Design a protein around this motif. Structure first.
Motif, PDB file in Angstrom:
ATOM      1  N   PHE A  88      53.441  44.789  41.342  1.00  0.00           N
ATOM      2  CA  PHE A  88      52.349  44.877  42.327  1.00  0.00           C
ATOM      3  C   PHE A  88      51.441  46.065  42.075  1.00  0.00           C
ATOM      4  O   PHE A  88      50.323  46.110  42.587  1.00  0.00           O
ATOM      5  N   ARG A  89      51.960  47.057  41.379  1.00  0.00           N
ATOM      6  CA  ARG A  89      51.184  48.200  40.909  1.00  0.00           C
ATOM      7  C   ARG A  89      50.070  47.790  39.959  1.00  0.00           C
ATOM      8  O   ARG A  89      48.912  48.185  40.137  1.00  0.00           O
ATOM      9  N   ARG A  90      50.402  47.027  38.921  1.00  0.00           N
ATOM     10  CA  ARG A  90      49.366  46.550  38.020  1.00  0.00           C
ATOM     11  C   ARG A  90      48.394  45.673  38.784  1.00  0.00           C
ATOM     12  O   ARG A  90      47.176  45.741  38.583  1.00  0.00           O
ATOM     13  N   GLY A  91      48.939  44.816  39.646  1.00  0.00           N
ATOM     14  CA  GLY A  91      48.112  43.966  40.473  1.00  0.00           C
ATOM     15  C   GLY A  91      47.152  44.763  41.328  1.00  0.00           C
ATOM     16  O   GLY A  91      45.984  44.417  41.436  1.00  0.00           O
ATOM     17  N   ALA A  92      47.636  45.844  41.941  1.00  0.00           N
ATOM     18  CA  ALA A  92      46.792  46.700  42.768  1.00  0.00           C
ATOM     19  C   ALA A  92      45.729  47.417  41.949  1.00  0.00           C
ATOM     20  O   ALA A  92      44.576  47.517  42.382  1.00  0.00           O
ATOM     21  N   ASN A  93      46.095  47.952  40.780  1.00  0.00           N
ATOM     22  CA  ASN A  93      45.094  48.590  39.929  1.00  0.00           C
ATOM     23  C   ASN A  93      43.998  47.600  39.571  1.00  0.00           C
ATOM     24  O   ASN A  93      42.804  47.872  39.753  1.00  0.00           O
ATOM     25  N   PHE A  94      44.392  46.417  39.111  1.00  0.00           N
ATOM     26  CA  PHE A  94      43.403  45.439  38.701  1.00  0.00           C
ATOM     27  C   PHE A  94      42.680  44.820  39.890  1.00  0.00           C
ATOM     28  O   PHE A  94      41.541  44.381  39.735  1.00  0.00           O
ATOM     29  N   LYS A  95      43.295  44.802  41.074  1.00  0.00           N
ATOM     30  CA  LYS A  95      42.604  44.346  42.272  1.00  0.00           C
ATOM     31  C   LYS A  95      41.540  45.348  42.682  1.00  0.00           C
ATOM     32  O   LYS A  95      40.458  44.965  43.129  1.00  0.00           O
ATOM     33  N   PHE A  96      41.838  46.643  42.548  1.00  0.00           N
ATOM     34  CA  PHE A  96      40.823  47.657  42.798  1.00  0.00           C
ATOM     35  C   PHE A  96      39.677  47.526  41.806  1.00  0.00           C
ATOM     36  O   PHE A  96      38.503  47.617  42.185  1.00  0.00           O
ATOM     37  N   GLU A  97      39.995  47.308  40.525  1.00  0.00           N
ATOM     38  CA  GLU A  97      38.934  47.097  39.543  1.00  0.00           C
ATOM     39  C   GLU A  97      38.131  45.843  39.877  1.00  0.00           C
ATOM     40  O   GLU A  97      36.902  45.827  39.744  1.00  0.00           O
ATOM     41  N   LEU A  98      38.813  44.782  40.308  1.00  0.00           N
ATOM     42  CA  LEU A  98      38.130  43.554  40.689  1.00  0.00           C
ATOM     43  C   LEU A  98      37.216  43.785  41.882  1.00  0.00           C
ATOM     44  O   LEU A  98      36.105  43.249  41.937  1.00  0.00           O
TER      45      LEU A  98
END
Lengths: 89, 283, 60, 282
Positions: free
Chosen positions: B113-123
């Motif tokens: 979920f960490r990678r998901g959160a980083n990439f969700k912030f980028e998104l």
């Protein structure tokens, strides 16, 4: 004629006045289902206003202008109590 | 160097799953998909080397799809990150958004979920700046902050929540923005000086002057730093101005505040809506 | 003179902190990198354990 | 998505060890436990995706128990149990999970510090929090991590002084002083340390030791000698020596006016004033 009218209390939301003409008239604009036409209604047992039928205000809502809110210190969407008023009694 | 088009054609030829009678004699199709993905990755690296970033992104996307078909979800997510990466460098925001979405789904499904959160912030950043899809950016920032909170990362969740609250207040959702500011205040207790101010401003954009006064009092009593801060005085002045309905006094206070501490576009919008609310009150 | 020296020391420290702030950006990136390779490593280690077990059963 | 309840049922079915005659033909039970743990982890991730944090924590706990039975990951699963229980508001299960993870790791110090935090804030079990902080600081010291051990010892001394153990808190403050001496980064910490130590020694009615601590701090640390904390400690020592509680109150107000006091100091000085009152009863 104020002899007969439903005196039951209603809780109504304060909203922006429909337009400048209604604010100028200084009359509480209410729906026909809310209260009869051209009768005095008290609010919070302190603020008295004359009702006028208005189809633009849905039932259960009361319209006020900026000055009335300043007098009562009310914000938009605030809930106030409205009842029938009889100054003569 | 090999022709990337020929490599893609070979990958497509190898990417056909075994069907019918052949399936009884052909081994697992995973190896064919892996080979097709490798060919696509090679063609795509050649394209990137040629600065044809969009074609390289498409080829990473094909490789990621083949990797998904092969069961190698982590490699697919890395390749999707590569697709997003090159699309963003190539100016193709939509394909970049899509690649981030597949990568985020892959990572979340694998517990990252960490990678998901980083990439969700980028998104969310991509949505806010490149595509101007403010609602989706708000959703992405809120979700990224929530997952970061689940990881006990106070500061990233605080950053994501700052972005979410900023966009929400700019989007007409003042109450939700104030709630997020309260969350930021609670997480940050012990940014706060501004938080209180911003929260109050949002509560004042919602015409709830009483809530703004409550926020000011809470900030003054809880945080000694905020009590003597210029932000506290400015918020009190704004609350007083809205209480007296003196729009000109509010403008004077805003100019005074600007003279010592420059205002930002967020505050400009909030106070403009507040002044227009006074004008609506005037109506 | 004391206030000017104080201003000078504060400026120098801001200098050091932005430099330190540029290093921590490099560090956060590196940590994302080392959490990507360590995940791969955990997966590969499990795969090796399982494969070795399968060979153990084969030889038996 | 698979039903987490069905996955847990399958894990329980697979989690039964081989017994009797079947044990002579069935291989090692480790694989069955591993499969049950994987099923529990899947069901628990599904629970986590549904925000049913307590059920997810229970399922991580079951997976961790199965992993322990398999000889492996159980501690990490216990850490996940702690994470989701803490997010779910179940402090007791979080404490239990941290305990199993700590035992497995003995990481133990970090999770012991987190456990002490949970005990101090969520469960108010101050004695266990003190024990956890002391142990975490000791292990950190064994790893040569001076600053983390110093943090753990600060927490331990704070709780111990608040708990009526003034002498032990002062001893821990002396340890902190010795560890932080000569470090330019921790100067202020020292400046406070001395003060706090003296305050504890003054809470124990031990004014001579407070004077000794003040003299040691003045002579050893030049910064503390000219610090407001040193003057405040000297004023408190003088006030206790003359038995003038009102003078102590005036000094406390003066100290608050420039440097705000914290609840720890409030409690220490309140017990000191009540000790002056006890002397007045005497």
């Amino acid at each position: 004629d104020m002899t007969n009218m439903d005196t039951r209390t209603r809780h109504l939301k304060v909203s922006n006045c429909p337009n400048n003409s209604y604010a100028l008239a200084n009359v509480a604009a209410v729906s026909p289902n809310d209260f009869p036409n051209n009768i005095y209604i008290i609010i919070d047992n302190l603020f008295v206003f004359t009702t006028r039928h208005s189809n633009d205000i849905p039932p259960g809502t009361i319209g006020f202008n900026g000055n009335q809110r300043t007098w009562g210190g009310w914000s938009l969407n605030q809930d106030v109590q409205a009842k029938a008023f009889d100054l003569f009694k | 160097m090999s022709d990337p088009v020929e490599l893609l054609k070979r990958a497509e030829k190898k990417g056909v799953p075994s069907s019918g009678f052949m399936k009884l004699f052909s081994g697992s199709d995973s190896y064919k998909f892996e080979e097709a993905a490798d060919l696509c990755v090679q063609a795509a690296t050649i394209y990137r080397l040629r600065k044809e970033l969009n074609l390289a992104g498409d080829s990473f996307l094909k490789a990621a799809d083949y990797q998904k078909k092969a069961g190698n979800e982590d490699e697919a997510g890395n390749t999707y990150v590569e697709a997003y990466k090159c699309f963003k460098s190539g100016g193709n925001s939509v394909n970049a958004v899509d690649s981030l979405e597949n990568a985020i789904q892959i990572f979340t499904h694998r517990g990252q979920f960490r990678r998901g959160a980083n990439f969700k912030f980028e998104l969310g950043e991509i949505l806010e700046n490149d595509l101007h899809d403010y609602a989706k950016a708000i959703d992405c920032y809120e979700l990224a902050g929530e997952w970061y909170a689940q990881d006990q990362s106070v500061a990233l969740s605080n950053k994501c929540f700052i972005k979410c609250a900023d966009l929400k207040a700019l989007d007409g959702q003042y109450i939700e923005a104030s709630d997020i500011y309260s969350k930021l205040i609670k997480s940050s207790m012990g940014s706060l000086k501004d938080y209180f101010l911003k929260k109050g401003l949002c509560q004042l954009a919602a015409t709830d002057a009483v809530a703004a006064a409550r926020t000011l009092q809470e900030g003054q009593s809880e945080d000694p730093n905020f009590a003597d801060s210029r932000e506290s005085n400015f918020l009190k002045s704004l609350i007083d101005a809205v209480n007296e309905g003196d729009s000109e006094q509010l403008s004077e206070h805003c100019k005074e505040f600007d003279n010592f501490m420059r205002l930002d576009k967020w505050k400009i919008t909030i106070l403009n809506k507040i002044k227009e609310s006074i004008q609506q009150q005037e109506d | 003179s004391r206030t000017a020296e104080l201003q000078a020391e504060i400026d120098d420290t801001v200098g050091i902190m932005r430099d330190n702030i540029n290093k921590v950006a490099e560090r956060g990136e590196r940590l994302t990198s080392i959490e990507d390779k360590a995940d791969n490593l955990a997966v590969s280690a499990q795969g090796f354990k399982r494969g070795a077990n399968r060979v153990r059963k084969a030889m038996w």
